[PDB]
Amino acid sequence: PYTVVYFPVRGRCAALRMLLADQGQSWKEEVVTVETWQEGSLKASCLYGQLPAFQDGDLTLYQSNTILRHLGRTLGLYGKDQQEAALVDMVNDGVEDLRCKYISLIYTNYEAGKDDYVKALPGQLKPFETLLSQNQGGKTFIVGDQISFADYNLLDLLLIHEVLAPGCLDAFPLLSAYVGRLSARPKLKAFLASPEYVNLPINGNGKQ
């Protein structure tokens, strides 16, 4: 019932793929090559002229976070009540802010800004360590005691930063244990080790 339309990279689709895989959902991948994209017709039919695009039956959605929220809403990964839902949103928005900075670094000035970015990293990750400490001592998920779409988004963000700055999580015990714990979930573990994930570049420009 699901179709994700995207370029052949993990990018902004990694988190939603992990979510679908971990939740045991099936989906079809519609790969869009740079050639096809530069042709122009697909772009013109996209609401904001960008991908990913997602189809749930006849519902066509755009915007990665909208897709995540939609899945969180339909699959029950949006907290147990309104208070938790608000907290889940707060976590996801924080993830999105840092993701934008990451994306900017990767595509705008990797060479020149990498050092400053890595130096500033600890300050950027602290908020998530704090959130974790306030939720049952970081023994469960980011919000509440059930997994939410924010968890998958945060997991991806942490994983790609471990590739960018190996060991950046060493100074954060809760985050470190969190990544290990989530990465150990049966279906997610199988997915993260599959060619489907491993053989796709993280970003489109060969930088990471």
Ligand X SMILES: CCCCCCSC[C@H](NC(=O)CC[C@H]([NH3+])C(=O)O)C(=O)NCC(=O)O
Binding residue positions for glutathione: 6, 12, 37, 43, 50-51, 63-64
Our CB check for a copy of itself shows the closer of 130 and 194 to be: 130
The footprint of a copy of itself (CB under 8 A) covers 47-49, 59, 61-63, 65-66, 69-70, 73-74, 82-83, 85-86, 89-90, 93-94, 97, 100, 123, 127, 130-131
- Output the smallest distance, CB 205 to ligand X, in A: 7
| DSSP bridge partners of 3 | 28, 55
Our CB check for a copy of itself shows the closer of 58 and 115 to be: 58
Amino acid at 62: Y
Positive or negative, the Cα torsion across 16, 19, 21, 27?
A: negative
Nearest CA to 75 out of 22, 136, 28 is that of 22
C-alpha pair distances (Å), 21 with each of 48, 161, 189, 197, 207: 27, 22, 10, 11, 26
The contact set with ligand X (CB under 6 A) reads 7, 9, 11-12, 34, 43, 49-52, 63-65, 93, 97, 204
